[PDB]
Design an enzyme around this catalytic site. Structure first.
Site, PDB file in Angstrom:
ATOM      1  N   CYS B 106       0.843  -1.196   0.000  1.00 55.67           N
ATOM      2  CA  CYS B 106       0.000   0.000   0.000  1.00 55.67           C
ATOM      3  C   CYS B 106       0.877   1.244   0.000  1.00 55.67           C
ATOM      4  O   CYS B 106       1.649   1.462   0.942  1.00 55.67           O
ATOM      5  CB  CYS B 106      -0.943   0.027   1.209  1.00 55.67           C
ATOM      6  SG  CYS B 106      -1.904   1.594   1.319  1.00 55.67           S
ATOM      7  N   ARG B 109       0.059   4.324   3.078  1.00 59.32           N
ATOM      8  CA  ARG B 109       0.119   4.082   4.510  1.00 59.32           C
ATOM      9  C   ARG B 109       0.579   5.280   5.329  1.00 59.32           C
ATOM     10  O   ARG B 109       0.667   5.149   6.554  1.00 59.32           O
ATOM     11  CB  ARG B 109       1.042   2.905   4.794  1.00 59.32           C
ATOM     12  CG  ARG B 109       0.476   1.583   4.401  1.00 59.32           C
ATOM     13  CD  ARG B 109       1.510   0.529   4.630  1.00 59.32           C
ATOM     14  NE  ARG B 109       2.428   0.421   3.510  1.00 59.32           N
ATOM     15  CZ  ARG B 109       3.595  -0.210   3.569  1.00 59.32           C
ATOM     16  NH1 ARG B 109       3.985  -0.776   4.705  1.00 59.32           N
ATOM     17  NH2 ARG B 109       4.365  -0.275   2.499  1.00 59.32           N
ATOM     18  N   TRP B 278      -9.000   6.724  -0.408  1.00 57.46           N
ATOM     19  CA  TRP B 278      -9.273   7.520  -1.587  1.00 57.46           C
ATOM     20  C   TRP B 278      -8.285   7.116  -2.680  1.00 57.46           C
ATOM     21  O   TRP B 278      -7.227   6.528  -2.418  1.00 57.46           O
ATOM     22  CB  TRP B 278      -9.195   9.020  -1.286  1.00 57.46           C
ATOM     23  CG  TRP B 278      -7.891   9.418  -0.710  1.00 57.46           C
ATOM     24  CD1 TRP B 278      -6.704   9.610  -1.390  1.00 57.46           C
ATOM     25  CD2 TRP B 278      -7.609   9.659   0.667  1.00 57.46           C
ATOM     26  NE1 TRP B 278      -5.716   9.960  -0.509  1.00 57.46           N
ATOM     27  CE2 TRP B 278      -6.241   9.992   0.760  1.00 57.46           C
ATOM     28  CE3 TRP B 278      -8.382   9.635   1.835  1.00 57.46           C
ATOM     29  CZ2 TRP B 278      -5.635  10.299   1.976  1.00 57.46           C
ATOM     30  CZ3 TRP B 278      -7.774   9.932   3.037  1.00 57.46           C
ATOM     31  CH2 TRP B 278      -6.416  10.268   3.099  1.00 57.46           C
ATOM     32  N   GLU B 283      -4.751   4.575 -10.487  1.00 57.60           N
ATOM     33  CA  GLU B 283      -5.629   3.425 -10.273  1.00 57.60           C
ATOM     34  C   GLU B 283      -6.802   3.412 -11.241  1.00 57.60           C
ATOM     35  O   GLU B 283      -7.207   2.350 -11.724  1.00 57.60           O
ATOM     36  CB  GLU B 283      -6.162   3.426  -8.852  1.00 57.60           C
ATOM     37  CG  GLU B 283      -5.124   3.183  -7.793  1.00 57.60           C
ATOM     38  CD  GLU B 283      -5.772   3.067  -6.429  1.00 57.60           C
ATOM     39  OE1 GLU B 283      -6.327   1.986  -6.138  1.00 57.60           O
ATOM     40  OE2 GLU B 283      -5.761   4.067  -5.671  1.00 57.60           O
TER      41      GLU B 283
HETATM   42  C1  HEM Z   1      -6.118   6.582   1.981  1.00 58.93           C
HETATM   43  C2  HEM Z   1      -5.517   6.520   0.786  1.00 58.93           C
HETATM   44  C3  HEM Z   1      -5.013   5.197   0.148  1.00 58.93           C
HETATM   45  C4  HEM Z   1      -4.302   5.145  -0.984  1.00 58.93           C
HETATM   46  C5  HEM Z   1      -3.855   6.358  -1.822  1.00 58.93           C
HETATM   47  C6  HEM Z   1      -4.022   3.756  -1.281  1.00 58.93           C
HETATM   48  C7  HEM Z   1      -3.308   3.289  -2.359  1.00 58.93           C
HETATM   49  C8  HEM Z   1      -3.103   1.964  -2.690  1.00 58.93           C
HETATM   50  C9  HEM Z   1      -2.711   1.465  -3.993  1.00 58.93           C
HETATM   51  C10 HEM Z   1      -2.459   2.317  -5.255  1.00 58.93           C
HETATM   52  C11 HEM Z   1      -2.599   0.141  -3.914  1.00 58.93           C
HETATM   53  C12 HEM Z   1      -2.213  -0.747  -5.117  1.00 58.93           C
HETATM   54  C13 HEM Z   1      -3.376  -1.696  -5.394  1.00 58.93           C
HETATM   55  C14 HEM Z   1      -3.682  -1.759  -6.869  1.00 58.93           C
HETATM   56  O1  HEM Z   1      -2.963  -1.087  -7.663  1.00 58.93           O
HETATM   57  O2  HEM Z   1      -4.643  -2.494  -7.240  1.00 58.93           O
HETATM   58  C15 HEM Z   1      -2.928  -0.260  -2.547  1.00 58.93           C
HETATM   59  C16 HEM Z   1      -2.932  -1.516  -2.001  1.00 58.93           C
HETATM   60  C17 HEM Z   1      -3.396  -1.846  -0.735  1.00 58.93           C
HETATM   61  N1  HEM Z   1      -3.979  -0.970   0.189  1.00 58.93           N
HETATM   62 FE1  HEM Z   1      -3.910   1.073   0.188  1.00 58.93          FE
HETATM   63  N2  HEM Z   1      -4.575   2.975  -0.284  1.00 58.93           N
HETATM   64  C18 HEM Z   1      -5.207   3.829   0.615  1.00 58.93           C
HETATM   65  C19 HEM Z   1      -5.919   3.412   1.726  1.00 58.93           C
HETATM   66  C20 HEM Z   1      -5.934   2.156   2.283  1.00 58.93           C
HETATM   67  C21 HEM Z   1      -6.631   1.763   3.500  1.00 58.93           C
HETATM   68  C22 HEM Z   1      -7.538   2.727   4.322  1.00 58.93           C
HETATM   69  C23 HEM Z   1      -6.375   0.459   3.694  1.00 58.93           C
HETATM   70  C24 HEM Z   1      -6.848  -0.456   4.843  1.00 58.93           C
HETATM   71  C25 HEM Z   1      -7.341   0.032   5.986  1.00 58.93           C
HETATM   72  C26 HEM Z   1      -5.492   0.004   2.626  1.00 58.93           C
HETATM   73  C27 HEM Z   1      -4.962  -1.247   2.459  1.00 58.93           C
HETATM   74  C28 HEM Z   1      -4.337  -1.713   1.315  1.00 58.93           C
HETATM   75  C29 HEM Z   1      -3.915  -3.088   1.091  1.00 58.93           C
HETATM   76  C30 HEM Z   1      -4.075  -4.281   2.060  1.00 58.93           C
HETATM   77  C31 HEM Z   1      -3.361  -3.162  -0.122  1.00 58.93           C
HETATM   78  C32 HEM Z   1      -2.798  -4.457  -0.716  1.00 58.93           C
HETATM   79  C33 HEM Z   1      -3.571  -4.740  -1.988  1.00 58.93           C
HETATM   80  C34 HEM Z   1      -3.427  -6.186  -2.341  1.00 58.93           C
HETATM   81  O3  HEM Z   1      -2.642  -6.915  -1.657  1.00 58.93           O
HETATM   82  O4  HEM Z   1      -4.096  -6.598  -3.322  1.00 58.93           O
HETATM   83  N3  HEM Z   1      -5.254   1.065   1.801  1.00 58.93           N
HETATM   84  N4  HEM Z   1      -3.218   0.882  -1.844  1.00 58.93           N
HETATM   85  N1  LIG Z   2      -6.576   4.255  -3.141  1.00 61.14           N
HETATM   86  C1  LIG Z   2      -7.111   3.088  -2.731  1.00 61.14           C
HETATM   87  C2  LIG Z   2      -7.533   2.965  -1.410  1.00 61.14           C
HETATM   88  C3  LIG Z   2      -8.106   1.774  -0.991  1.00 61.14           C
HETATM   89  C4  LIG Z   2      -8.249   0.729  -1.890  1.00 61.14           C
HETATM   90  C5  LIG Z   2      -7.813   0.897  -3.198  1.00 61.14           C
HETATM   91  C6  LIG Z   2      -7.975  -0.242  -4.177  1.00 61.14           C
HETATM   92  C7  LIG Z   2      -6.634  -0.959  -4.278  1.00 61.14           C
HETATM   93  C8  LIG Z   2      -6.751  -2.234  -3.494  1.00 61.14           C
HETATM   94  C9  LIG Z   2      -6.436  -2.209  -2.139  1.00 61.14           C
HETATM   95  C10 LIG Z   2      -6.547  -3.376  -1.390  1.00 61.14           C
HETATM   96  C11 LIG Z   2      -6.981  -4.555  -1.999  1.00 61.14           C
HETATM   97  C12 LIG Z   2      -7.307  -4.574  -3.354  1.00 61.14           C
HETATM   98  O1  LIG Z   2      -7.739  -5.746  -3.922  1.00 61.14           O
HETATM   99  C13 LIG Z   2      -7.847  -6.929  -3.130  1.00 61.14           C
HETATM  100  C14 LIG Z   2      -8.241  -8.108  -3.992  1.00 61.14           C
HETATM  101  C15 LIG Z   2      -8.536  -7.940  -5.345  1.00 61.14           C
HETATM  102  C16 LIG Z   2      -8.893  -9.036  -6.131  1.00 61.14           C
HETATM  103  C17 LIG Z   2      -8.951 -10.306  -5.561  1.00 61.14           C
HETATM  104  C18 LIG Z   2      -9.308 -11.412  -6.327  1.00 61.14           C
HETATM  105  C19 LIG Z   2      -9.365 -12.662  -5.717  1.00 61.14           C
HETATM  106  C20 LIG Z   2      -9.063 -12.787  -4.362  1.00 61.14           C
HETATM  107  N2  LIG Z   2      -9.109 -14.003  -3.756  1.00 61.14           N
HETATM  108  N3  LIG Z   2      -8.716 -11.698  -3.641  1.00 61.14           N
HETATM  109  C21 LIG Z   2      -8.656 -10.472  -4.208  1.00 61.14           C
HETATM  110  C22 LIG Z   2      -8.302  -9.376  -3.425  1.00 61.14           C
HETATM  111  C23 LIG Z   2      -7.192  -3.407  -4.111  1.00 61.14           C
HETATM  112  N4  LIG Z   2      -7.256   2.068  -3.600  1.00 61.14           N
END
Ligand code: HEM
Ligand SMILES: Nc1cccc(CCc2cccc(OCc3ccc4ccc(N)nc4c3)c2)n1
Ligand code: HEM
Ligand SMILES: Nc1cccc(CCc2cccc(OCc3ccc4ccc(N)nc4c3)c2)n1
Ligand SMILES: C[C@H](O)[C@H](O)[C@H]1CNc2nc(N)[nH]c(=O)c2N1
Ligand SMILES: C[C@H](O)[C@H](O)[C@H]1CNc2nc(N)[nH]c(=O)c2N1
Ligand SMILES: [Zn+2]
Lengths: 411, 407
Positions: B106, B109, B278, B283
């Site tokens: 993320c 963070r 947000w 994205e």
């Molecule tokens: C507040 C502004 C936030 C921004 C700008 C942001 C941005 C991002 C971005 C760009 C990704 C890449 C995922 C992708 O490209 O599909 C990501 C992943 C992730 N975000 Fe953040 N996020 C935010 C908030 C949060 C919050 C509030 C949480 C949880 C409380 C969170 C948890 C995660 C997690 C767990 C991932 C891992 C995604 C995965 O493993 O598929 N994010 N985030």
């Molecule tokens: N700025 C911002 C803020 C919050 C969330 C986002 C979207 C990016 C994001 C964050 C965390 C998780 C995530 O996707 C989890 C996912 C997606 C597809 C799956 C398909 C199969 C599976 N078993 N798990 C999955 C989990 C995306 N952006």
């Protein structure tokens, strides 16, 4: 053990068995991934196993594994190691070794070409002048009047580590960089340290923004010597843009032949510390890194002013706009001048084809995603969505310490 | 074993000791790096509880205190008896914030401590879940001044009583496969759009149909619910230069709210825990609009820009990709909806990395995911070495429910 990688764009899945042949360590453990770390005198003790494995590889590739020529070669290397403490590669072996070091370079997106490597054997070289001669011929051959050809020139292998051959330049052709007393840099900031070594070694600097550096060449452990590549051998391309006529007025040019000269070629336990190799540029190496990196020529600002971009807030993406235009200009200039270049779209598409073909014919293809994905427009290139397995195969190109930090100075 | 990370743009070196606290495994080995792979009982539970409570009481500087020891005993007694245990509200909030703090993929963070935690562990029905989600969506949306939030539904008990939000995000556009061959709407959601129709949903069969919520409480069959449209803030996408851009008919929703992940705190498993923040602009503009497996509008955009699409070396995709992403930011900003650009968000992450190395000893980070999908090397994270390791509390992936649910 079999390992699957998925392409998430096409759902194509490939099975890697080649990682089983991997001996060297990656830097990672079960508890920490070092996937994004830049970097995470060999006795007869460990040399013959390394030799045997390479020769096992070599003879398998020629479908002669277990032949009498294979056994006799093992025996000859065995006795030569225990007698002389090292051994010499046959020419066939050196050429196989060199191509496979490239084939194994997991950070290289250009590996579709790996089998078309021209190998120049410079192992009879003994002096810096002789190295200059070999390097000149490499540059002329590789350049080929703009129709670039991949080549590597291999100087004598390390013996006791006190007699190394080294090319002290990071690339055979690179522009000088000069730190000014006022803190500004003239030329290529990447090359300031090496420029200062050259000037100290007696080089008379033009002190311009695009001065080709001298070759600094070390033979057989002696102090390095300065040689100027003949300018007619150095193909350069003036950078202009196909729609922006003021772009030529930025005064930019780049050289055509990317020729890496600071790496170490390891083949069957032998260490070739001077092994300059060259291919041709992917456009983003110049347009994104060499011109737009904050620590390089850093022309983003000037190009954005001349494009009259909203430079106040970064969310205008003036940086990304200027970056694309600079990269358009680089590709347009090289193609206009009939100098081989490949755009990052074409190169990554080829890599995917290469990688799939390697999984089928070889059982895998080590690839470093961090390095394979281009530094702009990553996700619209097909490698971004490709899962990749990174592991270390030999023969390999390895990093080695900068020579000025290890060299014992004769005087 | 005390590891340094260098930034090569700035030569700044940080020393990582936090990784030695890592418990879970990365999937890599000394022989093979898997950094680019998408996903590489009473006795087990109490050590997990002890570890989490130990860091909790350390974080409030009551480590080794009566309250610490008493809570350890209390949870020990509850596990021995009830075979699970319940988190104090304070531990739940700490746990949730720290799962974000440890989310190595993320880039966002830096905001981790300002997370709004909604305790929904009293919830028992899909309707109840729907109420909690609407309140989440409305709170987090805040009329465009977005606020981070997580809503936490009852923890897993025996895997037969799971709470699951079947939607991958609370708000996502429907995807329909056309008889002609191609796909209308969002292709990423075609299978889910089918499950919604296959469960009773009446699809408008448009291009930006907000999908319904498919909510599962206590392990029962999931239930469909239409999020009230007045709660779904949407942004029409226009370009601050090209007036023909509005004619592409593009819009996107303001609230990214992930709902398919599993939140693990002290060994307790929260299978339903939708969270939201947000958007970073890329994205939507890079991935949602321009992925070939998604809205894939680059061709049509570059057409309207009259770019030379005959050779890839014109970089017409790159040029179009930039304009699309300029428009996304311009649209969200013009409509006063929170968004951050990849330059701002990555610059924030380096500052955040600096802070975590300073006040915590490190910061797990997955370079492959932190680097934005466009303009990678002109962002500061590109030249930043990062160490990736798994800390807990964590957000984890979990199987898709329709592959598991006993109907
Ligand atoms: C507040 C502004 C936030 C921004 C700008 C942001 C941005 C991002 C971005 C760009 C990704 C890449 C995922 C992708 O490209 O599909 C990501 C992943 C992730 N975000 Fe953040 N996020 C935010 C908030 C949060 C919050 C509030 C949480 C949880 C409380 C969170 C948890 C995660 C997690 C767990 C991932 C891992 C995604 C995965 O493993 O598929 N994010 N985030
Ligand atoms: N700025 C911002 C803020 C919050 C969330 C986002 C979207 C990016 C994001 C964050 C965390 C998780 C995530 O996707 C989890 C996912 C997606 C597809 C799956 C398909 C199969 C599976 N078993 N798990 C999955 C989990 C995306 N952006
Ligand atoms: C022919 C066209 C070639 C292209 C387009 C190409 C492309 C690239 C690019 C873009 C990189 C990334 C380096 C960076 O961004 O700094 C790279 C890395 C590398 N290339 Fe290739 N290359 C080519 C030929 C060769 C040849 C002939 C060799 C050796 C025989 C080679 C060996 C390597 C190695 C060892 C790396 C690792 C870089 C490192 O570890 O720093 N390449 N290549
Ligand atoms: N298309 C293309 C084709 C060939 C070469 C290139 C340049 C990209 C490249 C490829 C291979 C190696 C390489 O550089 C290795 C390197 C660089 C700097 C170092 C600094 C110190 C040190 N100890 N080792 C270093 C090794 C660059 N592009
Ligand atoms: C193959 C690779 O793991 C996959 O394409 C990843 C790469 N990096 C990513 N990075 C982000 N931020 N989001 C993603 O979905 C992905 N996908
Ligand atoms: C920190 C990071 O590993 C480093 O900056 C890498 C990232 N990926 C790269 N990829 C390429 N092709 N070339 C590079 O120099 C780098 N630098
Ligand atoms: Zn790894």
């Amino acid at each position: 053990r079999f390992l699957k990688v998925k392409n998430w764009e096409t759902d194509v899945v490939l099975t890697d068995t080649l990682h089983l042949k991997s001996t060297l360590e990656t830097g990672c453990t079960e508890h920490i991934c070092m996937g994004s770390i830049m970097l995470p005198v060999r006795t007869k003790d460990q040399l013959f196993p390394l030799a045997k494995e390479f020769l096992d590889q070599y003879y398998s590739s020629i479908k002669r594994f277990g032949s009498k020529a294979h056994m006799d070669r093992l025996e000859e290397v065995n006795k030569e190691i225990e007698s002389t403490s090292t051994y010499q590669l046959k020419d066939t072996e050196l050429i196989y070794g060199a191509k496979h070091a490239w084939r194994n370079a997991s950070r290289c997106v250009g590996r579709i070409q790996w089998s078309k490597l021209q190998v120049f054997d410079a192992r009879d070289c003994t002096t810096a002048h002789g190295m200059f001669n070999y390097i000149c011929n490499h540059v002329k051959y590789a350049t080929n009047k703009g129709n670039l050809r991949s080549a590597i020139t291999i100087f004598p292998q390390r013996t006791d580590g006190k007699h190394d051959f080294r090319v002290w330049n990071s690339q055979l052709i690179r522009y000088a960089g000069y730190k000014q007393p006022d803190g500004s840099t003239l030329g290529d900031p990447a090359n300031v340290q090496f420029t200062e070594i050259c000037i100290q070694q007696g080089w008379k600097a033009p002190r311009g923004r695009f001065d080709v550096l001298p070759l600094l060449l070390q033979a057989n452990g002696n102090d390095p010597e300065l040689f100027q590549i003949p300018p007619e051998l150095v193909l350069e391309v003036p950078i202009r843009h196909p729609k922006f006529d003021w772009f030529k007025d930025l005064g930019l040019k780049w050289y055509g032949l990317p020729a890496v000269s600071n790496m170490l070629l390891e083949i069957g336990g032998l260490e070739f510390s001077a092994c300059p190799f060259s291919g041709w540029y992917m456009g983003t190496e110049i347009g994104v890194r060499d011109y737009c990196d904050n620590s390089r020529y850093n022309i983003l600002e000037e190009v954005a002013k001349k494009m009259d971009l909203d430079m106040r807030k970064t969310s205008s993406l003036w940086k990304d706009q200027a970056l694309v235009e600079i990269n358009i200009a680089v590709l347009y200039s090289f193609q206009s001048d009939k100098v081989t270049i490949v755009d990052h779209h074409s190169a990554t598409e080829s890599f995917i084809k290469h990688m799939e073909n390697e999984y089928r014919c070889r059982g895998g293809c080590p690839a470093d995603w961090v390095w394979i994905v281009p530094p702009m427009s990553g996700s619209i290139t097909p490698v971004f969505h490709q899962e990749m397995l990174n592991y270390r195969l030999t023969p390999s190109f390895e990093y080695q310490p900068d020579p000025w930090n290890t060299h014992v100075w004769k005087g």
